[PDB]
Amino acid sequence: TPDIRADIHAELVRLSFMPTRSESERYAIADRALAQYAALEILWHDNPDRTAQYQRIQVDHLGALLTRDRYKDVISHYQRLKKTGQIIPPWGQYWVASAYLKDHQPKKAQSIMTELFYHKETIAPDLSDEELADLF
Amino acid sequence: TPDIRADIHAELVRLSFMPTRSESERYAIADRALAQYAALEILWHDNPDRTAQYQRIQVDHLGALLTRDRYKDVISHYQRLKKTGQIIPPWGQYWVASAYLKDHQPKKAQSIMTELFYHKETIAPDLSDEELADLF
Amino acid sequence: DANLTPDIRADIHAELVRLSFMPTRSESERYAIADRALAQYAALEILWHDNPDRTAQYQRIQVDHLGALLTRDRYKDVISHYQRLKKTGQIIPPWGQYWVASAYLKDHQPKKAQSIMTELFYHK
Amino acid sequence: DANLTPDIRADIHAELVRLSFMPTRSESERYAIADRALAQYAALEILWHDNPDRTAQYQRIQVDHLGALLTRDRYKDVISHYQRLKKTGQIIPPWGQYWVASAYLKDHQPKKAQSIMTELFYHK
Ligand SMILES: [Cl-]
Ligand SMILES: [Cl-]
Ligand SMILES: [Mg+2]
Ligand SMILES: [Mg+2]
Ligand SMILES: [Mg+2]
């Protein structure tokens, strides 16, 4: 049930990115999601049993804020999510880049896109647990 | 002055890693640092003007906890530092690995050492700010 | 033991493509390293085309090739190669989609670049 | 334009060493790719030794060589190469120190491995 409430929030945020929709309509659907959010924020804040779908709406919230052209809020919500050590999925980083750009702040948008597309190669000497141990 | 107080804390934590020193002595010097910490934690908690040297003692604290063989506390302090989105320097990760290992939990120690030694290569199409913009 | 050598040859192709994206480097240097990879490709293209035992290695270089084309500013070729790889129904990894978007954009074709980036971040 | 080719040859050496550390791979595969790099090295060793214009590229392969030796389980050689590179006063990057520690450890010499790791995390 909390899953489907987060699912509904997510759907609304996605419906907000319709270019088929005008500014009036976009803004109105962004609001339906901003509101569903405000409610669930409060309902779920102090609850370890709803920790999962809390984190989801936290990110989907970046979409709604951006859709309603509240650029500085997307950044401040991002920065607030950062300081909870929560991992922003890539699509969430796409949103905050868009925002950083529209706030006349492109260098930050670039650094986000850079950190999104790299290649990583380990240099881990295959060590046994007993060999890693003999190192401490 | 806060710099030199953090400097003193750091020095104590380093003096705790002397193998030249016995268990009694090690434990005693770990305590001098655990205490200096407890004080500075409180003195500095709600202070944006001391945010820098706060973060330093936060990490140096992992050393003292580990030196006094309080393995589970090093992990719980680490995990608490994680959820503040604070960046643990490599030497701090070395400490928490040692702890994860001594808590009979080696797979986590390995994953830390792995994430410490990699190679990273960007795949960033060099895009202009005006071209990154034309993408949003 | 038999996929080891071709694996490393595809691995070296990939590395060259990635070395071409180092922004520290000028146009002449970029172009030179892009060429080393465009060439490694042209060779392996021929060596492998009709070979089921290197079908995996073939497909890798096919995508890594998008990078080299883009790095050497051959935008229109990146798109034609993309569209050709699309019609073989093989997956373009995300980094590959980012590449073809950059190309679509530099070919003065931005609405199609957005459409690519849309499909690139889809989680439903 | 003249450091470009030697740069890419050192770059390819490095990549091979790194491909050797992929833990997905068996002993036979690891050993085979370690050899491709040990060989690339032996060639460049000779080609470059007495050449001030490739002194940079020379020094790179010198460190990357620690990886290949270690990957092929030639522990005692990693240490002797380390100690030889040490006496030329050139910096071993951190990842290089991690390598020689692993070697010192596998040569049943753990107290020296700790001493290396000590110097590896020093910030005072
Ligand atoms: Cl082509
Ligand atoms: Cl040798
Ligand atoms: Mg690489
Ligand atoms: Mg690649
Ligand atoms: Mg390397």
Residue numbers in the entry:
A (entry chain AAA), B (entry chain AAA): 224 to 359
C (entry chain BBB), D (entry chain BBB): 220 to 343
What's written in the study?
After attempting multiple truncated constructs of the TPR domain (PgaA-32-465, 32–448, 32–431, 32–415, 32–398, 32–382), we found PgaA-32-367 to be the most stable and amenable to crystallization. Diffraction quality crystals were obtained, and the structure was solved using selenomethionine incorporation and the single wavelength anomalous diffraction (SAD) method and refined against a 2.85 Å native dataset. The asymmetric unit contains two molecules (chains A and B), which were modeled from residues 224–359 and 220–343, respectively. There was no remaining unexplained electron density suggesting that the original construct had further fragmented and that only the C-terminal fragment containing residues 220–359 had crystallized. As there is no evidence that PgaA forms a dimer in solution, we presume this domain swap is a crystallization artifact and that only residues 220–342 represent a biologically relevant fold. The structure of PgaA 220–342 is all α-helical and contains TPR-3 and TPR-4, as well as an unusually long α/α-motif containing 46 amino acids that likely represents α/α-5 based on our bioinformatics analysis. The α/α-5 motif differs noticeably from the common TPR fold and locally increases the curvature of PgaA, thus forming a groove with conserved residues on the concave surface of the TPR-like module running parallel to the superhelical axis (groove 1). This increased curvature also results in a groove running diagonal to the superhelical axis on the convex surface with conserved residues from the α/α-5 repeat lining the groove (groove 2). Analysis of the structure revealed that residues lining groove 1 in chains A and chain B are both involved in crystal packing. Combined, these results suggest that dPNAG binds to the conserved groove on the concave TPR surface of residues 220–367 and that W314 and W318 are involved in this interaction.
